[PDB]
Design a protein around this ligand. Structure first.
Ligand SMILES: C[N+]1(C)[C@@H]2C[C@@H](OC(=O)C(O)(c3cccs3)c3cccs3)C[C@H]1[C@@H]1O[C@@H]12
Ligand SMILES: CCCCCCCC/C=C/CCCCCCCC(=O)OC[C@H](O)CO
Ligand SMILES: CCCCCCCC/C=C\CCCCCCCC(=O)OC[C@H](O)CO
Ligand SMILES: CCCCCCCC/C=C\CCCCCCCC(=O)OC[C@H](O)CO
Ligand SMILES: CCCCCCCC/C=C\CCCCCCCC(=O)O
Ligand SMILES: CCCCCCCC/C=C\CCCCCCCC(=O)O
Ligand SMILES: CCCCCCCC/C=C\CCCCCCCC(=O)O
Ligand SMILES: O=C(O)CN(CCN(CC(=O)O)CC(=O)O)CC(=O)O
Length: 392
């Protein structure tokens, strides 16, 4: 009949339902796989993965409920579920998403403190503190968003949202929406950006050195100064330089340890041992280093340093950053357009049609779908665990 759906409507809605349904299923299955991977693998049960587990929970909630409800809204052309379900859905959406953002913040700060304070922070990095931070993120998200979405109509004394529509009445004013965007999206993005910059600039060739010196001996600033000073002394010394240049990272760090303990002049006295180190003859160098007063005065430390010279490993004493960077990149890329629309809406509401708004809003969801793929691509343990889970 003439009341039936026209061809364009049918094709459009079937396409939308197919694509969005597929993304929903992929999101749900993916995040379930991530959570299960964290649950079953003992090697994947670290604080970072507690955080990642939380994020996976958020992404699961988004993929299961948010996507489908929003697609109901899109396909129907209006809201057919009522004002109550509208409120519940909006609250769920914004609380869970905010919790995701704060989760990313916690992760970023955690990595930052891990690479910048490798002596004091890892000791205070318990699972209790992790759970405290996660709970804090979710609770704060709820306290910050749920009242604004649910109780604002009560404060005003009137719900201005039509029963056939669904939007946050609190965010009616473009200015308020933008300020909210600043507090919720822009500032965390900036902070995480700075943190990522400092993390990427932070060498992990020196992080092991601090632990080494910690073993052989808030005082991290002292180490930060003294290590640099030692390296400077090595580069200043005409005899220590060629040995330092012709040495691997671990063993050159051992040389740095020697300079740290005795000074550039004291280490420069080990002519035979240094020249032996140049030819990478670790055994001979060890035997010649056993003849020194240094080996007798501090026997244990000398044993550790010499053994370190022998094996070239930390036996006498990384992909996560990449994964997290991938997650952050997905977040930024997927959420940026909508918030840019929020920015434009402050002076020009007509420049952004409802279709573009809808595309952006939905685009923010895709992040939850991307994250498990980031786990499976930037990490091999998660991938192997996935493969082990699909057949078990
Ligand atoms: C698709 N979402 C579900 C909704 C719209 C987008 O929202 C965002 O990008 C915003 O920066 C804001 C948009 C408008 C005012 S503040 C955030 C909102 C909440 C936490 S961060 C992303 C998510 C988020 O839950 C909202
Ligand atoms: C509108 C109202 C919205 C309400 C929304 C409610 C969301 C509830 C989700 C809680 C998950 C919290 C994250 C928990 C992450 C840690 C869990 C854990 O303990 O993982 C250990 C893992 O096995 C390693 O050993
Ligand atoms: C806007 C919000 C700003 C808060 C930013 C807080 C950033 C806190 C960084 C602390 C820090 O950088 O410390 C490293 C150093 O090794 C020991 O303090
Ligand atoms: C990560 C951090 C995310 C933080 C997220 C915060 C969300 C908002 C919560 C409290 C602000 C409440 C401010 C209320 C001030 C008045 C608002 C107003 O007047 O709104 C009018 C409305 O637009 C038409 O009636
Ligand atoms: C997960 C939640 C998914 C949707 C819950 C409501 C489903 C109802 C379908 C649309 C109702 C209608 O056609 O009027
Ligand atoms: C998600 C939950 C869906 C609950 C549906 C309740 C709304 C009923 C109103 C209606 O279908 O006409
Ligand atoms: C994290 C939990 C996600 C949501 C789980 C709960 C699923 C939905 C549960 C029941 C919804 C009840 C509200 C429906 C209101 C109906 C009244 C009306 O039609 O106006
Ligand atoms: O052209 C139309 O409107 C569709 N036709 C074909 C029949 N309808 C089914 C029906 O309403 O009986 C096909 C359709 O669903 O479009 C209705 C009619 O002219 O009687």
């Amino acid at each position: 009949g003439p009341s039936s759906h026209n061809r364009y409507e049918t094709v459009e809605m079937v396409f939308i339902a197919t694509v969005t349904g597929s993304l929903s299923l992929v999101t749900v299955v993916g995040n379930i796989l991530v959570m299960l991977s964290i649950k079953v693998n003992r090697q994947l049960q670290t604080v970072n993965n507690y955080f990642l587990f939380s994020l996976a929970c958020a992404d699961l909630i988004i993929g299961a409920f948010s996507m489908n409800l929003y697609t109901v809204y899109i396909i129907k052309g209006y809201w057919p579920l009522g004002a109550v379900v509208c409120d519940l859905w909006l609250a769920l959406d914004y609380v869970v998403s905010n919790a995701s953002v704060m989760n990313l913040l916690i992760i970023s700060f955690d990595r930052y403190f891990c690479v910048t304070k490798p002596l004091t922070y890892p000791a205070r990095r318990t699972t209790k503190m992790a759970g405290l931070m996660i709970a804090a993120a979710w609770v704060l998200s709820f306290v910050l968003w749920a009242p604004a979405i649910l109780f604002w109509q009560f404060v005003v004394g009137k719900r201005t949202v039509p029963d056939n529509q669904c939007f946050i009445q609190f965010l009616s004013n473009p200015a308020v929406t933008f300020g909210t965007a600043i507090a919720a999206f822009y500032l965390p993005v900036v902070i995480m950006t700075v943190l990522y910059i400092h993390i990427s600039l932070a060498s992990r060739s020196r992080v092991n050195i601090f632990e080494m010196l910690r073993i052989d001996e808030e005082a991290e600033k002292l180490f930060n100064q003294d290590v640099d000073a030692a390296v400077r002394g090595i580069l200043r010394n005409a005899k220590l330089k060629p040995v330092y240049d012709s040495l691997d990272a671990v063993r050159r760090a051992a040389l740095i340890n020697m300079v740290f303990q005795m000074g550039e002049t004291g280490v420069a006295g080990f002519t035979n041992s240094l020249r032996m180190l140049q030819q990478k003859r670790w055994d001979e160098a060890a035997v010649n280093l056993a003849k020194s007063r240094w080996y007798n005065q501090t026997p244990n430390r000398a044993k550790r340093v010499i053994t370190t010279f022998r094996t070239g490993t930390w036996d006498a004493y990384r992909k996560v950053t990449r994964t997290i960077f991938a997650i952050l990149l997905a977040f930024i890329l997927t959420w940026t357009p909508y918030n840019v629309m929020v920015l434009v809406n402050t002076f020009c509401q007509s420049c952004i049609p409802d279709t573009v708004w809808s595309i952006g809003y939905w685009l923010c969801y895709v992040n939850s779908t991307i994250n498990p793929a980031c786990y499976a691509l930037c990490n091999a343990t998660f991938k192997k665990t996935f493969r082990h889970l699909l057949l078990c």
